[PDB]
Specification:
part of a larger assembly, 5 chains, A mainly alpha (56), B mainly beta (251), C alpha+beta (233), D alpha+beta (68), E alpha+beta (121), A: 56 residues, mainly alpha, C: 233 residues, alpha+beta, two-stranded antiparallel ribbon, 9 helices, binds magnesium ion, binds zinc ion, RNA-binding, Large ribosomal subunit protein eL34A (chain A)
Chain lengths: 56, 251, 233, 68, 121
RNA sequence: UAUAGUUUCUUUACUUAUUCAAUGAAGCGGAGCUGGAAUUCAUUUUCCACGUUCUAGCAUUCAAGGUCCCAUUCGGGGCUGA
RNA sequence: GUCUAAUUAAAACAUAGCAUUGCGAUGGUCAGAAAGUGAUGUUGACGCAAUGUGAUUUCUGCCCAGUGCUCUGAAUGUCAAA
């Protein structure tokens, strides 16, 4: 019950991963992958435009 | 005589709406700066059912541009919208289902819904299941847009007014019979107390103008003037015609 | 230097939560602020009738500094110097038996509205100063016409608070010199010559011209655009 | 004295100056509350005609009442 | 001159200097004595046979107590008047509108030995 | 038929009265920089935009950087970035 | 399914279905002594409000002269105060 979470230790309420006691392991995996790939594609969208502007 | 049932609903005691299980008002996002200069992106998190309403609602999450915060908004879901869909709202947004473009920036024939009749009212025309507004034309000078509403009326409204592109979901709801007083009872258990309906001609004349008589009969004409008063308006108010509709409305 | 980098943030529409900008133009001000601003707006969008805007033309700051320099030589007596004056007079009443004329004749600026109107009507006033910031303006709207009828030079000057500082009050709303010393009558004449040119000699033409009729920025621009879109050929 | 001029001027309510000034004051008094303290009287001649004196313990309230 | 920069469109009432009172004269001119002292929280004992059985067996004194007194006050008043350490206090409001306190003392003291010192047994 | 004047009505315009609505009153109006179209008949007329659209991620510490001061020290302030 | 608690439980009421009527919000229906006041409305024509008939099947014929309702407004019609 909610108030009983104040009587127990931190180890009983989290796991040792990022977003540990809030998000699932596979959801964390998904958002890691999404972040990495979307930032790489942001770089790519940037250099495409940097190519087009130097061209024209 | 006695105060009649239609007079008695205005006091709003047992006739008020039952709004316990309603998720909130289905409003468009406030028209702040981004929706009139560019676009803002939000995301559909869930499509939920709203009590008292056939159309489903979409919980769309946008970001606050001025504070670190995650303001949520309640849209009426358009048919074809799904969870994890990116909604784009504003002037320079793309003509796709679920986007909140202005009406000036859409072509003619476009099907929209939840249309502001005045910019900033955050949701009006075409809000119910299966309903949509059609754009007909533009007056770019005298910046205005003519639209066909679901009633058949034509309306001139500002081009800066907004609308959600697509059709309101839940269409086809009134095609199914209820078959049961109980199904109607549960329909109106969550809307308001307007059911069951006793016929005025089944009443005493103290309770209703049509009441009384040794046969059930209205006696005088059920067509009531618009300049009648409360207590007289029980029948067909300001009826231009009457009877079975034989042909085109000619509108 | 190798540890620091350039992040720069894109404060475009759908990016990068906006920074703290000066929203001094968008404040929800208190109602007294809005009253005192929209009042001065409304008093110039309306066609002001010439008896008002008889004001709105005030003494230039240079000749105003000069006339206040003059008037500050003729200032009333404070409580302290009045008290020692009357101690001297009580001493003299006993020892010299003067007829209350042991003290000399005073030369002081005449103030008070009912006093000064009477001075003007009796033509004892040499110069009159009139404040523009009077909140019931009907207290002073008649004073230019009266000074003109009786031949008195008047000057509408900025600051009833300045007149009050001049005369040991907070506000005075009017001031007047009726008698001046010979050391300064020449400057008084030099001053009246400059003032009558600006106020009394222009009375008959500023009595014709209605004030106000002034527009805001967003409306004057909409009028100018319409004009220069109409005046092309 | 000035109070005589004030008295004869307040009687010219349809003159341009006074109808302009009415036009402005009716707005400023409509923006304030139905009952509000006035620092000083708008019509001091009238006030002292009616008994007002500019000493401590005399107070001016301005009040608007609905018409009809 | 220039004007102040304001990063919010909201105007708040400024914080002004709040004075404290040091006024001119007192409100009631004499501080009232203690409305509830040890001789008013403990009115008298209770000598029912039921209560005297609690004295011999449980080391429990049974007192009549002011309806305004709480357990802190009862404990403090017992420690003051009878020079005894207290373990627990239990209170009830009787059907006659008075308050009854069961005071359990520590094992060092004997309610039986201090009751006949109070003058009842 | 045209007048200098008085006078009613119709149509239209203004905004400050009044009215409506919204907002934690956040980006209005005008002008200017920059790009594109642009035809220029001298030299520039204007008109369009003037950071975000494969992805159910993230976006917060007067912003990092740049530059000038103080009094170096722990650091602090201003302008720009905007 | 519902009702005349304490003489009437029914063929009465309701019902699903059917049809009509008004209303695109400066709105329709209703309330309130008033109001910077309200219910419908956390609503928006697949909605709200007002009526009638009363599952299904098969049909719902003629009459707009009368009373009503509604629509039109150039008028030797009438038509109040100002
Ligand atoms: Mg664990
Ligand atoms: Mg019911
Ligand atoms: Mg009956
Ligand atoms: Mg009747
Ligand atoms: Mg009948
Ligand atoms: Mg009957
Ligand atoms: Mg208890
Ligand atoms: Mg705003
Ligand atoms: Mg019975
Ligand atoms: Mg029976
Ligand atoms: Mg029946
Ligand atoms: Mg309404
Ligand atoms: Mg008449
Ligand atoms: Zn998960």
């Amino acid at each position: 019950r909610p108030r009983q979470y104040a009587t127990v230790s931190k180890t009983h309420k989290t796991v040792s991963r990022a977003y540990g006691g809030s998000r699932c392991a596979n959801c964390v995996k998904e958002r890691i992958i999404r972040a990495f790939l979307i930032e790489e594609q942001k770089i790519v969208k940037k250099v495409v435009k940097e190519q087009t502007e130097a061209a024209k | 005589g006695r105060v009649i049932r239609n007079q008695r609903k205005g006091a709003g005691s047992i006739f008020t709406s039952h709004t316990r299980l309603r998720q909130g008002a289905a409003k468009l996002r406030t028209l702040d700066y981004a929706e009139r200069h560019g676009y803002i992106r939000g995301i559909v998190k869930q499509i939920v059912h709203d009590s008292g309403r056939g159309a489903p609602l979409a919980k769309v999450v946008f970001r606050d541009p001025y504070k670190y915060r995650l303001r949520e908004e309640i849209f009426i879901a358009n048919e074809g919208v799904h969870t994890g869909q990116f909604i784009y709202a504003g002037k320079k947004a793309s003509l796709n289902v679920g986007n909140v473009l202005p009406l000036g920036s859409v072509p003619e024939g476009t099907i929209v819904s939840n249309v502001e009749e005045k910019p900033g009212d955050r949701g009006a025309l075409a809000r119910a299941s299966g309903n949509y507004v059609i754009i007909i034309g533009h007056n770019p000078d005298e910046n205005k847009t003519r639209v066909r509403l679901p009633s058949g009326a034509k309306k001139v409204i500002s081009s800066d007014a907004r609308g959600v592109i697509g059709v309101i979901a839940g269409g086809g709801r009134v095609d199914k019979p209820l078959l049961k007083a109980g199904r109607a009872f549960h329909k109106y258990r969550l809307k308001r107390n307007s059911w069951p309906k006793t016929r005025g001609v089944a009443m005493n004349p103290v309770d209703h103008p049509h009441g009384g008589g040794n046969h059930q009969h209205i006696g005088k004409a059920s067509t009531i003037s618009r300049g009648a008063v409360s207590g007289q308006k029980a029948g067909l108010i300001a009826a231009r015609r009457t009877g079975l509709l034989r042909g085109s409305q000619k509108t | 230097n190798p540890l620091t980098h350039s992040t720069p943030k894109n404060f475009g529409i759908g990016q990068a939560v906006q920074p703290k900008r000066n929203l001094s133009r968008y404040v929800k001000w208190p109602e007294y602020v809005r009253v005192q601003r929209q009042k001065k707006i409304l008093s110039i969008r309306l066609k002001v009738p010439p008896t008002i805007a008889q004001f709105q033309y005030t003494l230039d700051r240079n000749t105003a500094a000069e006339t206040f320099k003059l008037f500050n030589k003729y200032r009333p007596e404070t409580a302290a110097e009045k008290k020692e004056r009357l101690t001297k007079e009580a001493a003299a009443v006993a020892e010299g038996k003067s007829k209350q004329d042991a003290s000399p004749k005073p030369y002081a600026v005449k103030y008070g509205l009912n006093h000064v109107v009477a001075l003007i009507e009796n033509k004892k006033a040499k110069l009159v100063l009139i404040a523009n910031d009077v909140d019931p303006i009907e207290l002073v709207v008649f004073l230019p016409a009266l000074c003109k009828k009786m031949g008195v030079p008047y000057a509408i000057v900025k600051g009833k608070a300045r007149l009050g500082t001049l005369v040991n009050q907070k506000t005075s709303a009017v001031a007047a010199l009726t008698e001046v010393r010979a050391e300064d009558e020449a400057a008084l004449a030099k001053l009246v010559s400059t003032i009558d040119a600006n106020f009394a000699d222009k009375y008959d033409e500023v009595k014709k011209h209605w004030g106000g009729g002034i527009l805001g920025n967003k409306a004057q621009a909409k009028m100018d655009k319409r004009a220069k879109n109409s005046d092309s050929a | 004295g000035a109070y005589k001029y004030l008295e004869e001027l307040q009687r010219k309510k349809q003159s341009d100056v006074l109808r302009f000034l009415q036009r402005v004051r009716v707005w400023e008094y409509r923006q304030k509350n139905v009952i509000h303290r006035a620092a000083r009287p708008t019509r001091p001649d009238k006030a002292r005609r009616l008994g007002y004196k500019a000493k401590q313990g005399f107070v001016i309230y301005r009040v608007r009442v609905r018409r009809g | 001159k220039a004007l102040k920069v304001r990063t919010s469109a909201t105007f708040r009432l400024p914080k002004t200097l709040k004075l404290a009172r040091a006024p001119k004269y007192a409100s009631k001119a004499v501080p009232h004595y203690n409305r509830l002292d040890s001789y008013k929280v403990i009115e008298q004992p209770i000598t029912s046979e039921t209560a005297m059985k609690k004295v011999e067996d449980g080391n429990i004194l049974v007192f009549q107590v002011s309806m305004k007194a709480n357990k802190y006050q009862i404990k403090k008043a017992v420690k003051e008047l009878y020079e005894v350490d207290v373990l627990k206090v239990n209170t009830l409001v009787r059907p006659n509108g008075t308050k009854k306190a069961y005071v359990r003392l520590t094992a060092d003291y004997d309610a039986l030995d201090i009751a006949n010192r109070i003058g009842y047994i």
